[PDB]
Amino acid sequence: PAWTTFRVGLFCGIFIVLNITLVLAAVFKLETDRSIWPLIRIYRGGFLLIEFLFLLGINTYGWRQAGVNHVLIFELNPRSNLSHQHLFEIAGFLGILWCLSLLACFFAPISVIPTYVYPLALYGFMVFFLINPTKTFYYKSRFWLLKLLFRVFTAPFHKVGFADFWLADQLNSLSVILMDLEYMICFYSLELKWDESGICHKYTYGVRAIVQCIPAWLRFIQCLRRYRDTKRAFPHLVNAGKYSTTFFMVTFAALYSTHKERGHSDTMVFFYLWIVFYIISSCYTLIWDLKMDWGLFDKNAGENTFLREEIVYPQKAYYYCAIIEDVILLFAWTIQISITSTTLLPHSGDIIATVFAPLEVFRRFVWNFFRLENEHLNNCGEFRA
Amino acid sequence: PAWTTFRVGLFCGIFIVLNITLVLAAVFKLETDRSIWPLIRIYRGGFLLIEFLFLLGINTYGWRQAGVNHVLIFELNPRSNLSHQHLFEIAGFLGILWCLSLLACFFAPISVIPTYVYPLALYGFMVFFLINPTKTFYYKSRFWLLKLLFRVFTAPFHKVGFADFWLADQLNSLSVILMDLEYMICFYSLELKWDESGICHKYTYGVRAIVQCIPAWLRFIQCLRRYRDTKRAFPHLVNAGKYSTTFFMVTFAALYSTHKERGHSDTMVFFYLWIVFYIISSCYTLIWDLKMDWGLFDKNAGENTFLREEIVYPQKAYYYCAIIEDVILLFAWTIQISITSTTLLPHSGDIIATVFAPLEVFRRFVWNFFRLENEHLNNCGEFRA
């Protein structure tokens, strides 16, 4: 309508200037004799979520304009849809809340409450806005999201729809948010509660491995449930392998990290095995994305050199840019592991992680941007008809 | 359209949060051993202009919705109109520039330029955005405004249209902006130009009197030109009297102020004469506004107790609220003069002036809100047909 567009404008404006204020306050008012990592490590989750919602708004716009309809694919209702302006405004609202909480963490405005209650309040509100039992604030769509989250987190007990698969895949890309939330739990359980601001931050007690692999587990058991429902082995078990490689990569990385902390002689072999398993996982997921989840590299593409037989997005350069971006964004782990194992600053692993997490969300953006199109065109996953 | 509404939202959001930041920086970072008056006295002009443009946007909305059409009255073009969202976004843009300049005056961001260049740059841009000789930034409407300003400031040489009269009246209400601009000229001509930040601020050399009465002069000579064009004495010379009273009030206030500064014995008589002349001016303009410029208090109003015979604005309470607001806003000078002449803080006259100038702009808001309606209904001024 019109009021929705005006609210998109209001929230986007407040957000851009809050970001300017936040950058300025971070460059200037950053004495911070204490360590600042227990703050950005807790706010990385909110940041990844807000960036993901912005990019999902852009995805919905691209779908609706290019021609690929997501009202039938997603099993939504042909009317009472959710345009992209709605996603933009709700992401902007969560961004306003994120920036306000972060500013309250920078300047301590109120002198009676400690500065550790602002992340707690921000995430408590982000949860209450989603479990809101009233008849307001996107009642229908938000409760559809709740039904979807309940049917995807209890995966091997329900029939696989396209929304289930799609949200399981999104959660498989946003693993840093789950790591963030479990880290916030661990911290607020294991930190002094007097005036300011370790066991976790490391893979010591294995909770990091479980939390990082739980979306891979979701998608793995989901595709196994689909293979039990139907009877076909090509796009089900070859798909389960892609998420078994994530299991193995996380396990070996955890063992290597704990052995490097303990300094045992079993560190180099586990490091090499982590290297080779992330290599096979990245090659696997790259081939899969370029072959099935996108349908590219078709056998009879005609004048289109490396594409399908037909296309929806007008500029053919978009697809080549997407191929390059998906082979660069994925495989960016090499820079990470090299710069962390070539004698850099002590606190640099988290620098690289925070730098490359929004880049991973961008990769998931592009992947959606093309997967919904391929699903509308070729019906890759046998979800309908 | 839609992009215009989104830009209204963007600018309104940036503006509200810039206002919050500005209020906070004014309450907290206000050491300011020096006097702060040469800053708010220079920014009051921009503030009154931005508030006036917001309220003119609201006026255009009220006109277009209530039914009173301003496309024929204002001699504009029935197509290529200017909706209220355009006024809102351009006022928001000037507000963004105002808030940015004021913040740059609070925090000195750049260390090489003195803090007196920001008001100069703000108003230089406000003038360049209006004299812009390109084919962009509201080319047609802005050059219509230039033609109107040139035909109204050279009043006694052109035929009086409704736009001429209306802008002369608006300028007759926004006299504080002209006082502000002449004061900025005087200051930047009579202030040290080394690192920071009197003859004016007072009515000493009479420039304040001339500047404060020049819109009254505009409207007076304009109604005299109209009386020469037509031949009718009721709504022309009785109208010229209303702006002759402003001449007399300003003259007597200037004489009283200069004699109080010089402490002569002629101060009390001039103060009493200023009192009585502002009394007669306020009663005159109140009776005129309630009788002719609004058409209220009709002789045959029917069931409507104190109104016209017909009305356009639905809630009848709006009109009574407007009568009360126009008899309160006008006549607010009594509080000013009493609190300034009953032994209050030295710097309090400018406090009261800055407090009551936006209130005067609000009075002009309501006056327009009803005058355009009465003009569409009864054709009070013989402007058409």
Burial class (CB in 10 A: 0-12, 13-18, 19+), A99: buried
Which amino acid makes up residue A14? I
Residue A150 sits in the same domain as residue A87: no
Nearest to A21 by CA among B20, B117, B118: B20
Nearest to B55 by CA among B91, B17, B21: B91
Q: How far apart are CA A18 and CA A366, in angstroms?
A: 27
Number of domains in chain A: 3
Of B9, B11, B16, the CB nearest to A7: B9
Residue finishing a domain among A260, A282, A304: A282
Residue A192 sits in the same domain as residue A68: no
Integer CA distances (angstroms), B162 to B59, B151, B165, in order: 16, 12, 5
Q: Which domain holds residue B89?
A: 1-131
CB contact under 8 A, B5 and A6: yes
**B214 part of a folded domain:** no
Of A5, A16, A18, the CB nearest to B6: A5
Q: Would you call A64 helix, strand, or coil by DSSP?
A: helix
End-to-end Cα spacing for chain B: 34
**A288 part of a folded domain:** no
Give B88-152 as a 3 state SS string.
HHHHHHHHHHHHHHHHHHHCCCCCCCCCCHHHHHHHHHHHHHHHCCCCCCCHHHHHHHHHHHHHH
Resolution of the experimental model in angstroms, please?
3.5
HSE-up of A244 (CA within 13 Å, CB side)?
Answer: 8
Which amino acid makes up residue B208? R
Instruction: Note whether A330 and A279 are within 8 A (CB).
Output: no
Q: How far apart are CA B240 and CA B246, in angstroms?
A: 10
For residue A121, the distance in angstroms to the closest alpha carbon of chain B comes to 22
CB pairs under 8 A between A and B: 53
Residue A347 sits in the same domain as residue A307: yes
Method for structure elucidation:
cryo-EM
Where residue B280 falls (left for φ over 0; alpha for ψ -120 to 50; beta otherwise) is alpha
Polymer length of chain A: 385
**B367 part of a folded domain:** yes
Residue A245 sits in the same domain as residue A121: no
Residue A222 sits in the same domain as residue A99: no
- Nearest chain B residue to A28, by CA: B109
Nearest to A272 by CA among A253, A299, A246, A298: A253
Residue A301 sits in the same domain as residue A339: yes
B7 CB neighbours in chain A (<8 A) are: 9
Nearest to A42 by CA among A248, A198, A253, A185: A185
Residue A59 sits in the same domain as residue A151: no
**B229 part of a folded domain:** no
Q: How far apart are CA B159 and CA A124, in angstroms?
A: 67
For residue A79, the distance in angstroms to the closest alpha carbon of chain B comes to 21
Q: Would you call B170 helix, strand, or coil by DSSP?
A: helix
Q: Which of A14, A16, A111 to mutate to test the interface with B (most CBs of B within 10 A)?
A: A14
CB contact under 8 A, A8 and B11: no
Residue finishing a domain among B131, B155, B186: B131
- Evaluate the CA torsion angle B132, B138, B143, B146 in order and state its sign: negative
Residue A76 sits in the same domain as residue A194: no
Burial class (CB in 10 A: 0-12, 13-18, 19+), B288: middle
Q: Which of A4, A7, A10, A21 to mutate to test the interface with B (most CBs of B within 10 A)?
A: A10
Query: Which residue is listed with tokens 């895949």?
Result: A169
Integer CA distances (angstroms), A292 to A63, A70, B36, in order: 19, 19, 68
For residue B118, the distance in angstroms to the closest alpha carbon of chain A comes to 20
Burial class (CB in 10 A: 0-12, 13-18, 19+), B214: middle
For residue A4, the distance in angstroms to the closest alpha carbon of chain B comes to 9
Residue A305 sits in the same domain as residue A275: no
Q: How far apart are CA B381 and CA B74, in angstroms?
A: 13
**A287 part of a folded domain:** no
Q: How far apart are CA B119 and CA B122, in angstroms?
A: 5
Nearest to B382 by CA among B258, B181, B230: B230
CB contact under 8 A, B5 and A10: no
- The DSSP H or E segment spanning A237 is helix A234-262
Instruction: Note whether B69 and B201 are within 8 A (CB).
Output: no
Nearest to A254 by CA among A319, A285, A210: A210
Query: Which residue is listed with tokens 């491995």?
Result: A209
Of B9, B16, B18, the CB nearest to A8: B9
Instruction: Note whether B103 and B18 are within 8 A (CB).
Output: yes
Q: Would you call A249 helix, strand, or coil by DSSP?
A: helix
Residues 6+ apart with CB under 8 A from B103: B18, B21, B22, B25
- The neighbour count for residue A299, using CB atoms within 10 Å, is 5
Residue A304 sits in the same domain as residue A183: no
Which amino acid makes up residue B34? R
Q: How far apart are CA B92 and CA B8, in angstroms?
A: 7
Helix, strand, coil percentages for chain B (3-state, nearest 5): 70, 0, 30
Nearest to B15 by CA among A336, A82, A13: A13
Residue finishing a domain among B83, B104, B131: B131
Our CA dihedral for B337, B339, B345, B350, rounded to 10 degrees, sits at -50
**B157 part of a folded domain:** no
For residue B53, the distance in angstroms to the closest alpha carbon of chain A comes to 19
CB contact under 8 A, A14 and B11: no
Residue A187 sits in the same domain as residue A158: yes
Which amino acid makes up residue A86? H
Integer CA distances (angstroms), A104 to A36, A39, A371, B35, in order: 14, 12, 40, 32
Residue A87 sits in the same domain as residue A199: no
Tokens of B249: 């009030």
**B170 part of a folded domain:** no
Nearest to A109 by CA among A117, B104, B14: A117
